[PDB]
Amino acid sequence: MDKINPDWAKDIPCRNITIYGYCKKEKEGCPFKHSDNTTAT
Numbered sequence: 001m002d003k004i005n006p007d008w009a010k011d012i013p014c015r016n017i018t019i020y021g022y023c024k025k026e027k028e029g030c031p032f033k034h035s036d037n038t039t040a041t
């Protein structure tokens with residue numbers, strides 16, 4: 001599996017958001033949907 005559609009990263013929370021509650025590297029090529037604006041369940 002070499003092709004990865006954004007739908008994959010957007011379905012997997014980054015350890016940053018999960019552990020640090022923030023992904024300062026989000027601005028970088030860090031994979032996953034790091035959404036820290038729309039706080040939802």
Ligand SMILES: [Zn+2]
Nearest residue numbers: 014016023030
């Ligand atoms: Zn990240």
